[PDB]
Amino acid sequence: YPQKNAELLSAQYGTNLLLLGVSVMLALAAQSGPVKEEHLLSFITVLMLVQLVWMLCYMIRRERASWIRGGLTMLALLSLIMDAFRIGYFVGYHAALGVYPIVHALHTISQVHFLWFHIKDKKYETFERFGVIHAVFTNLLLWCNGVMSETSMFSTSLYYLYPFNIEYHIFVSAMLFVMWKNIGRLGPLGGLVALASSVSVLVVYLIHMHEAAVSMFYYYGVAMMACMCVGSGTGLLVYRMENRPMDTNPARTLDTELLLASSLGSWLMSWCSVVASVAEAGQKSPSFSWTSLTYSLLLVLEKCIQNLFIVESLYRGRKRQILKNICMFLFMCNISLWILPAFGCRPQYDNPLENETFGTSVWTTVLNVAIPLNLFYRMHSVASLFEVFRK
Amino acid sequence: YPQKNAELLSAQYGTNLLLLGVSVMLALAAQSGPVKEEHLLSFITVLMLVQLVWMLCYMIRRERASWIRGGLTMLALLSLIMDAFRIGYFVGYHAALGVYPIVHALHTISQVHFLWFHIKDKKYETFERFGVIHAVFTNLLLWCNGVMSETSMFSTSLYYLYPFNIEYHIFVSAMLFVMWKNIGRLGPLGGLVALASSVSVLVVYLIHMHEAAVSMFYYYGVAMMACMCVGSGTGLLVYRMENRPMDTNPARTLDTELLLASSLGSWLMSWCSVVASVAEAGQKSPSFSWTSLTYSLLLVLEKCIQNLFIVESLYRGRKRQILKNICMFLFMCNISLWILPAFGCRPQYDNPLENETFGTSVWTTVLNVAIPLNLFYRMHSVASLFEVFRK
Ligand SMILES: CC(C)CCC[C@@H](C)[C@H]1CC[C@H]2[C@@H]3CC=C4C[C@@H](OC(=O)CCC(=O)O)CC[C@]4(C)[C@H]3CC[C@]12C
Ligand SMILES: CC(C)CCC[C@@H](C)[C@H]1CC[C@H]2[C@@H]3CC=C4C[C@@H](OC(=O)CCC(=O)O)CC[C@]4(C)[C@H]3CC[C@]12C
Ligand SMILES: CC(C)CCC[C@@H](C)[C@H]1CC[C@H]2[C@@H]3CC=C4C[C@@H](OC(=O)CCC(=O)O)CC[C@]4(C)[C@H]3CC[C@]12C
Ligand SMILES: CC(C)CCC[C@@H](C)[C@H]1CC[C@H]2[C@@H]3CC=C4C[C@@H](OC(=O)CCC(=O)O)CC[C@]4(C)[C@H]3CC[C@]12C
Ligand SMILES: CC(C)CCC[C@@H](C)[C@H]1CC[C@H]2[C@@H]3CC=C4C[C@@H](O)CC[C@]4(C)[C@H]3CC[C@]12C
Ligand SMILES: CC(C)CCC[C@@H](C)[C@H]1CC[C@H]2[C@@H]3CC=C4C[C@@H](O)CC[C@]4(C)[C@H]3CC[C@]12C
Ligand SMILES: CC(C)CCC[C@@H](C)[C@H]1CC[C@H]2[C@@H]3CC=C4C[C@@H](O)CC[C@]4(C)[C@H]3CC[C@]12C
Ligand SMILES: CC(C)CCC[C@@H](C)[C@H]1CC[C@H]2[C@@H]3CC=C4C[C@@H](O)CC[C@]4(C)[C@H]3CC[C@]12C
Ligand SMILES: CC(C)CCC[C@@H](C)[C@H]1CC[C@H]2[C@@H]3CC=C4C[C@@H](O)CC[C@]4(C)[C@H]3CC[C@]12C
Ligand SMILES: CC(C)CCC[C@@H](C)[C@H]1CC[C@H]2[C@@H]3CC=C4C[C@@H](O)CC[C@]4(C)[C@H]3CC[C@]12C
Ligand SMILES: C=C(C)COc1ccccc1NC(=O)c1[nH]cnc1C
Ligand SMILES: C=C(C)COc1ccccc1NC(=O)c1[nH]cnc1C
Ligand SMILES: C=C(C)COc1ccccc1NC(=O)c1[nH]cnc1C
Ligand SMILES: C=C(C)COc1ccccc1NC(=O)c1[nH]cnc1C
């Protein structure tokens, strides 16, 4: 069977799968069509079952860097803890919402065991193509279901565990698509101050009275992003002074594309905040404050300059010390900016300004898309910054 | 200035431009936010003005195949006729809706004159990068505005001219993105029967009483897509019999990717129709008919087999006659299937089944995304089929 024929048919089957899923979600979004949620959950359950059957055959036939695998395993284990909580709820409160968690837990176990023990190889190329493309778009549809459906201890625990589930499904979908295309072919002192201020702000918030806490969160974010922009810009300036060939790797290219694709969520969130801020300021209202406009423009500019710095640092006496201290300072700053959203410091959802401009559903869906991508971006940047720091 | 630095900053600026536009459209979609339509029209007017300023500088500094250019010129001239109609309306019925049509007409004139007389070149690479990426995302935002806002003779003419405007903006955006990435680097008898039946069905419909006309449209489409699937499949079978190396071009790759990206609209439309059909059939209702389910599954399968055939025909005595007659038959069938939507035979919008399942706004937006892409697909396939027919 010709290779191109399969590279094309696999892609068409996968795209049709995604568009059928999107069609069912559109029928659901209406809320007056016959299509109800349990039909979507059943569709995705069938799409997870087929993938389990495929991976089972694959493991039957197969018998006859670490940063991305450890990240996938830890996000899959958080997703599994969430599923265990959902199975416990179902058992206590007893149809499709009981059978979904169990096929989801089996799907995550099989998918971790597959990603870990996968071997690149040759006779079975159509099988691998159609199965990886099924896995990619089943994980995308699961990401979409999570983003659309999240709009005693069973309510307090999901709040903390949903971002990692959504981030797990988009991440594994990205890695599986990357695997499809290739078938058949002083700085420490500042860093510590950053970590301490982060953990403090988080404890303060989660103990909380509350408006002062969110104000403290925004002031922290603004100061942190300003000093980060300064660090990355000084790194770029030291690069521009020391004119070097700036030439030469698939891994480096994947890293660049992931680093720039993980920022779409935060950029959308920042531009929604800026649009709401200027719209409300047009009314000549007392509500307009410059700590949300500044914090959003600094979000945009900080992740732009950081992306530029990391990419220029990967494709490339006092300059060596200056780059070491800049890389360590940004390492610790990105850790400090990852700990806040991860540990429940997500105060954006209750913002009354973007809830009144965009509506509660649109704002919470934008945040559900953005905050998981933000966590991924921050920790991918931490990995890239350590890799730069070692060179 | 390093090249990568610019390839990256251009992409980040363009992505931020797109996300700011999407944020303004989200603020508009709510319908209760301060953001009203004239603010979007003004944003896009600024984004067209900046592009005109860029192209003016570019033409100042520059002094010191044909299928895709003729297609762009003819779709730009239809868009210009639409803009002339809008300027005439404004003049008769007299703020932002008057200044938008005129900057849009200037933008289309400048953009045609730019695409025609563009030269690949070297000192000014950052300028070209930032300007082509501005053009790509300004054309995308114009596509989005058209798709979202279309949801005496000034009402009858836009109905016929809007699909070509939307198709023009997505097409020119695609070509400009393709231009960005490369900076600094018997069958005739059946075919005639097809053409005659098309023109007949169209005249019948536009003269119309009406339910029989839409039924005739669906029966025509079903028979035509069945015989097309048979033709493409027989071509693929003749290929599979004659085992050939099936090896070896940038143009061929662009053609394949455009041919498969133009089908997303039709596939989404077909899967929405299938989801609505099975949802209504679940109620055990008398409305369920198999001429909409069949016509949708045939849409999906026909464009899959056609894509496969064209791609296998580009990357590659009675077999030669059989392939000539198959290519000519599909040439004329795709012309017959392009003439119906182009000349006003668009009966999908008034479908009560997908209007009740998905809602009128979601269905009309899905059709506004799909029917322009469908026209592009059909005529791109006609071009590819003639190119195959000559070899
Ligand atoms: C591989 C690439 C495309 C990245 C993955 C992203 C997609 C999976 C996204 C892109 C656009 C998304 C769609 C865009 C908007 C909608 C409409 C939304 O419903 C409404 O807006 C309801 C409208 C109403 O209020 O009536 C439901 C989700 C859906 C289908 C989204 C589902 C997920 C999609 C396909
Ligand atoms: C994952 C990477 C590769 C791409 C991310 C691109 C995002 C900018 C896209 C993808 C999904 C999109 C969302 C898909 C669906 C929705 C829900 C939609 O609102 C509803 O569905 C509510 C309807 C109602 O309340 O009646 C508003 C737009 C939004 C947030 C979309 C905004 C644009 C998003 C976030
Ligand atoms: C370069 C690639 C991404 C192709 C180009 C496609 C994008 C320009 C599309 C993909 C998803 C689209 C968005 C997905 C859904 C929405 C939500 C829609 O508003 C609602 O659904 C309102 C929700 C409600 O009812 O409350 C307005 C358009 C918007 C922002 C879309 C704008 C155009 C987007 C960004
Ligand atoms: C152009 C190529 C490269 C990609 C095409 C992908 C499409 C499948 C995406 C892009 C734009 C998306 C649309 C963007 C916005 C909308 C409008 C949205 O409905 C509303 O905004 C209505 C809100 C209301 O009525 O309150 C429903 C989903 C839909 C049609 C989205 C469905 C998925 C679409 C067609
Ligand atoms: C080892 C790696 C993967 C980290 C694991 C973190 C685990 C231990 C975390 C993640 C989410 C957490 C839960 C989130 C919230 C609640 C609800 C509260 O009323 C009791 C504690 C409980 C139930 C937490 C227990 C600890 C928990 C399960
Ligand atoms: C609604 C969302 C999806 C809008 C954004 C879609 C498009 C414009 C985005 C999505 C991801 C983006 C890519 C992500 C990363 C890279 C690698 C970088 O070295 C050059 C730019 C490039 C190649 C980007 C180009 C623009 C891009 C393709
Ligand atoms: C691997 C990483 C990402 C795991 C992160 C797990 C985080 C979210 C977990 C670890 C310990 C957890 C806390 C443990 C106990 C409590 C006390 C309880 O009364 C409220 C929830 C709260 C405050 C939990 C919140 C979530 C928490 C901070
Ligand atoms: C030369 C190429 C680009 C094709 C051009 C086609 C032109 C001539 C077509 C496209 C749309 C057409 C218009 C669409 C509908 C109407 C409204 C009707 O009440 C009078 C005729 C009028 C005003 C048409 C005149 C002819 C028209 C302008
Ligand atoms: C809502 C819409 C955008 C969903 C679809 C998005 C993704 C999955 C689609 C959009 C366009 C698609 C590409 C279009 C064309 C080609 C060239 C072909 O030789 C291999 C598949 C490939 C490379 C497709 C892969 C899947 C793809 C990237
Ligand atoms: C280059 C190609 C795509 C141009 C296509 C232009 C098409 C849409 C134009 C050409 C001539 C036009 C027709 C000319 C005259 C009339 C009679 C009028 O009472 C109703 C509109 C109607 C029936 C027009 C409909 C649109 C039309 C068919
Ligand atoms: C030991 C570890 C790296 C795990 O730390 C985590 C804990 C929870 C969630 C995610 C991650 N890690 C990541 O996401 C990561 N690391 C590098 N690249 C990515 C994408
Ligand atoms: C991190 C993300 C937002 C994931 O985005 C995706 C979503 C669905 C499918 C694929 C991808 N990512 C990619 O394909 C990619 N990223 C880098 N290099 C490639 C080839
Ligand atoms: C002489 C012509 C080709 C023009 O015919 C048209 C008329 C109206 C609208 C579009 C087109 N042509 C196309 O769209 C085309 N041709 C090849 N590739 C594409 C994308
Ligand atoms: C025909 C379309 C649906 C256009 O889709 C787009 C929309 C916005 C920007 C770019 C593209 N198309 C591409 O980038 C493309 N198509 C083929 N090869 C490339 C490199």
Numbering used by the authors:
A (entry chain A), B (entry chain B): 47 to 110, 124 to 153, 158 to 184, 187 to 216, 252 to 285, 305 to 327, 334 to 373, 376 to 443, ...
Study text:
The most potent, C2.2, fully blocked currents at 200 µM, and dose-response data were fit with an IC50 of 6.6 µM, more than 10-fold higher than the IC50 of C11. Comparing DrOTOP1_C2.2 with DrOTOP1_apo, we searched the C-domain pocket for non-protein density, but could not identify any, suggesting that C2.2 was not bound there either. Upon closer comparison, we found two regions on the intracellular half of the intrasubunit interface that contained more convincing cryo-EM density that could correspond to C2.2 molecules, compared to the C-domain pocket. We refer to these as the “outer site”, facing the lipid bilayer (right), and the “central site”, facing the central cavity (right). Notably, both sites are exposed to bulk lipid – the outer site to nanodisc lipids and the central site to the lipid-filled central cavity of DrOTOP1 – and were previously identified as cholesterol binding sites in DrOTOP1_apo (Fleft). Based on the shape of the density and accompanying local conformational changes, we conclude that C2.2 binds to both sites and replaces the endogenous cholesterols. Thus, the conformational changes resulting from two copies of C2.2 binding simultaneously are highly localized to the binding sites and nearby TMs. As per the binding pose that best fits our cryo-EM density, C2.2 forms the following interactions in the outer site: hydrophobic packing against many non-polar residues W126, G130, M133, L134, F271, F570, and M573, and π-stacking with W532. Considering other inhibitors discovered from the second round of screening, many contain functional groups like the carbonyl groups of Group 1 molecules and the heterocyclic nitrogen atoms of Group 2 molecules, that can potentially form similar H-bonds with E267 as C2.2 and C2.36, assuming the binding modes are similar. In the central site, C2.2 binds with the following interactions: hydrophobic packing with residues V201, F271, A274, V278, and A388, π-stacking with F277, and H-bonding with E384.
